[PDB]
Amino acid sequence: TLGALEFSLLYDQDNSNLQCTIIRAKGLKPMDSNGLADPYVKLHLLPGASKSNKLRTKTLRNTRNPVWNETLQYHGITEEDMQRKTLRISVCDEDKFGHNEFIGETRFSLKKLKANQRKNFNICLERV
């Protein structure tokens, strides 16, 4: 009931570069009545340094069907990272004061990605 998220991953191994295209979400669930339908996506590689392991898309405005159409790139990602790490993808709505309400997430173990082979996803969000 939470929403569907479309995204694409490509590990450009020769350039130590993980490109995460956050495409669109469909049907994100209305939550807080005092919240805003201003969705963004947060990426977190786990486990990880904090800071350096987080990337965020643009925040869009007044939509339950956002199209970010945005590529976030983690540089310096090696085969050791690909073996050890999980990409967590969380969709949040920004509120009136800049804080946020979590809608849902998905995770992908980077082990399962083949170097240089783009993988496309259309998943339903879950709360963990």
Distances (CA, A) of 22 to 44, 49, 90, 115: 13, 22, 11, 19
Confirm or deny that 32 is annotated as ligand binding.
yes
| 94 assigned to a ligand binding site | yes
38 is in an annotated binding site: yes
Give yes or no for a contact between 55 and 74, defined as CB atoms under 8 angstroms apart. Answer: yes
> Is 14 labeled as ligand-binding?
no
Q: Where are the domains of the chain?
A: 1-128
Resolution to 1 decimal, in Å? Answer: 1.9
Experimental method: X-ray
Contacts (Cβ under 8 Å, ≥6 apart) of 12: 18, 19, 116
Residue with tokens 């209305």: 30
Which two tokens mark 43? Answer: 């990426």
Q: Tell me which H or E stretch contains 36.
A: none
Q: Does domain 1-128 have CATH number 3.90.1640.10?
A: no
> Is the previous residue joined to 47 through a cis bond, with omega within 30 degrees of 0?
yes
**Contacts of residue 104, Cβ cutoff 8 Å, sequence gap at least 6:** 2, 3, 29, 90, 91, 125, 126, 127
Is position 12 annotated in a ligand binding site? no
Alpha carbon distance 17, 4 (integer Å): 26
